[PDB]
């Protein structure tokens, strides 16, 4: 089942990446990106390995057969010969094409639920202060240079260092201050107004 | 795997729809919906009909078979034959039925799967003013015609034309309105009492 | 700033067959299937095998007189016959039961 | 059709304090990130800052730090950029442009402005 | 901070011809390089970006090429009015952003 990952949400791949399945790619404040994840693409790799190796050890190897004789009396032991053959021969490249047409889809599917759990973990320890845009990138509501960005990587992020400060900014963006325009909707008035019965009386 | 989708969190099929197995439902100012998705169930329908043109063209169709003859001093000869057709035809039974049951569960994930890739879209690109409700659905906190019905069908849904007027009647909902009530706690009181002491004093 | 999630890109250009899709393109892959061979016929873990040439089994172990040449072989890996391996009896007649002699020979 | 006007320029008193703004129109200006580029007289370019699309992003050049701010009003569509305690050699003539992209690689600058003219003497 | 390089500092050509101008940096940018032309007191235009795509509205006669830490611009024809100042940008690592040198095209006699 397509999990709705590799060339879903997300775009195509990157080809500057090199050593590595899956990796960031951060914009702080001095430098990019484009840095591996060497903890969930070396799961990957043990579990292809073991896999492709498992595949290999299951067949095993046939040792000598020589094709045999036969007189003009005895054809009918010849074709029950060739059937035998024949048949042996079908059932082991049936099983061989069968083998292979479904390990295909367990092996994508398998890098596609990487992919999936690998943006699941950053969204869930980044539960506020992202600002998610779009085909899995976050924007950061607080400031972050490179410490923080192996805090994200190693999964450390201890988030409420930056809990409240974050919400500042927060409350920049979209906020109820725009509502409230600095002063109160007319009130301010009736007090210069409160202030002008007093210029009026004490004429 | 059950992906969730397929009598999950979503209920059962509608009847009404016909020309397709993926569709939306709108309600906007002038019709119900009812209007299928070309895109998904078209590779929904060229994926399973790879399928099944692949399973029929790896099974070999068999050529000329006929039954052998024995005199009585050959038994052990026959015996053999008869053990080979046996043999022969338990392996080729056991890997039909083997491969129907298999092949029935993934294309049932394979449409579970299609099911909660449509639904996550729907819902990636109505980040905000949506306001889901249960089973599949959403509400628009913003107003839609037909024009932005099938701009959601596309996928192009253009969110930034709408986004400060929705944001408006997204306040009007829970916001902080009601706890404001319209004017202040009471000090509009002390400013009409600020105004009481100039007519105490100016008696 | 922000760290977008991707993966690996490439620029090869092999093909895996699946169920769903014909030539699906993959970043990195693994044949399983052996096509190569020399044109030689080499010996098996180090002794030569035993080609009769022009001549057949049956008059090898006759000796045939224009089968000369091996006179004196006693030891092999493997035998081999070709497509012009027809000395076999010289005077006509019939060697009876040499298919059940060449399935006693292959096991020597 | 996508143009920008700006404005803001003049002879200023060294030390002083400028707003420059960039007017967008012919597009969504929410949807974008905007940059400032500027230009010694008879010399290359050079750039200056830049802000994303949402506004949560800023960034400066490096020998500028400090000494500059800028904003963006979405109702108005407008850019915003506040100079504070200027030098001698910041005259120039400047630009306020969109990117391409919404991405980090974000792809050139495909529409620009015309260019307002500073002079920073005394 | 990669520092580009462009070459040479002018180049001199006759009508009729062609034109070829050389972008170097410091370290090894992937693709992630524009160019920009300008006449003088007006605005940069874009020319082409990541060295193959040409832009929307540019003559054909134009091309770009290559990778690593060399790139490479490339003019097939003349009319008399592509005679202006030329400019290599790369936007891989940012910020800072880093342009070329301006490189002026001149006509020979």
């Known amino acids: 089942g397509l999990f709705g990952a590799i060339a879903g949400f997300i775009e195509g791949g990157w080809t500057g990446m090199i050593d590595g399945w899956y990796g960031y790619h951060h914009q702080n404040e001095q430098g990019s990106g484009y840095a591996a994840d060497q903890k969930s693409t070396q799961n990957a790799i043990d579990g292809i390995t073991s896999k492709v190796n498992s595949v290999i050890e299951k067949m095993n190897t046939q040792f000598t057969a020589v094709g045999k004789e036969f007189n003009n009396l005895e054809r009918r032991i010849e074709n029950l010969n060739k059937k035998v053959d024949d048949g042996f021969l079908d059932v082991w490249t049936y099983n061989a094409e069968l083998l292979v047409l479904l390990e295909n889809e367990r092996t994508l599917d398998f890098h596609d639920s990487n992919v999936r759990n690998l943006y699941e973990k950053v969204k869930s320890q980044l539960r506020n202060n992202a600002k998610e845009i779009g085909n899995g990138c976050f924007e950061f509501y607080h400031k972050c240079d490179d410490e923080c960005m192996e805090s994200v990587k190693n999964g450390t992020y201890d988030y409420p260092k930056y809990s409240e400060e974050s919400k500042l900014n927060r409350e920049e963006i979209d906020g109820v201050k725009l509502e409230s325009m600095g002063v109160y909707q007319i009130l301010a008035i009736y007090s210069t107004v409160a202030s002008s019965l007093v210029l009026l009386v004490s004429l | 795997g059950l992906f969730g989708a397929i009598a999950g969190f979503i209920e059962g099929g509608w009847t009404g729809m016909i020309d397709g197995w993926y569709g939306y439902h709108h309600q906007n100012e002038q019709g119900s919906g009812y209007a299928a998705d070309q895109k998904s169930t078209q590779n929904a329908i060229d994926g399973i009909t790879s399928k099944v043109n692949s399973v029929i063209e790896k099974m070999n169709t068999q050529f000329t078979a006929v039954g052998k003859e024995f005199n009585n001093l050959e038994r052990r000869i026959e015996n053999l034959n008869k053990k080979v057709d046996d043999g022969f035809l338990d392996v080729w039974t056991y890997n039909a039925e083997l491969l129907v049951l298999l092949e029935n569960e993934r294309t049932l994930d394979f449409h579970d799967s299609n099911v909660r890739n449509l639904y996550e879209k729907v819902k990636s690109q109505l980040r905000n003013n949506a306001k889901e409700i249960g089973n599949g659905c959403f509400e628009f906190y913003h107003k839609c015609d037909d024009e932005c019905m099938e701009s959601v069908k596309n996928g192009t849904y253009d969110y930034p034309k709408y986004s400060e007027e929705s944001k408006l009647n997204r306040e009007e909902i829970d916001g902080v309105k009601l706890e404001s009530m319209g004017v202040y706690q009471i000090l509009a009181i002390y400013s009409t009492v600020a105004s009481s002491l100039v007519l105490l004093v100016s008696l | 700033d922000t760290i977008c999630v991707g993966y690996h890109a490439n620029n090869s250009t092999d093909t895996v067959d699946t169920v769903l899709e014909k030539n699906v393109t993959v970043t990195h892959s693994v044949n399983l299937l052996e096509d190569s061979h020399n044109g030689k016929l080499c010996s098996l873990n180090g002794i030569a095998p035993l080609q009769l040439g022009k001549c057949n089994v049956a008059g090898w172990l006759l000796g045939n007189p224009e089968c000369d040449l091996l006179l004196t072989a006693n030891s092999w890996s493997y035998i081999i016959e070709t497509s012009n391996s027809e000395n076999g009896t010289c005077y006509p007649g019939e060697f009876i039961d040499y298919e059940e002699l060449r399935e006693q020979l292959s096991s020597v | 059709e996508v143009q920008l006007l700006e404005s803001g320029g003049g002879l200023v008193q060294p030390g002083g304090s400028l707003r420059l703004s960039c007017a967008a129109s012919?597009?969504?200006?929410?949807?974008?990130?905007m940059a400032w580029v500027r230009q010694a007289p008879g010399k290359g370019l050079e750039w200056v800052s830049f802000?994303?699309?949402?506004?949560?992003?800023?960034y400066f050049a490096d020998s500028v730090k400090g000494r500059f701010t800028i904003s963006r009003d979405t109702t108005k569509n407008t850019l915003y950029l506040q100079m504070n305690s200027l030098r001698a050699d910041d005259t120039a003539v400047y630009f306020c442009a969109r990117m391409r992209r919404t991405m980090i690689a974000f792809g050139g600058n495909d529409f620009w402005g015309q260019g307002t003219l500073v002079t920073v003497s005394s | 901070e990669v520092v580009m390089t462009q070459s040479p500092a002018t180049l001199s050509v006759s009508p009729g011809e062609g034109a070829t101008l050389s972008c170097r940096a410091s370290?090894?940018?992937?693709?992630?390089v524009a160019w920009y032309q300008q006449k003088p007191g007006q605005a940069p235009r874009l020319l082409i970006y990541g060295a193959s795509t040409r832009a929307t509205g540019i003559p054909a006669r134009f091309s770009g090429s290559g990778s690593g830490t060399e790139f490479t611009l490339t003019i097939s024809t003349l009319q008399s009015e592509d005679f202006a100042v030329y400019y290599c940008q790369q936007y891989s690592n940012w910020p800072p952003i880093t342009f070329g040198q301006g490189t002026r095209l001149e006509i020979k006699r």
């Open positions: 012919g597009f969504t200006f929410s949807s974008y990130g």
């Open positions: 802000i994303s699309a949402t506004g949560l992003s800023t």
């Open positions: 370290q090894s940018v992937n693709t992630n």
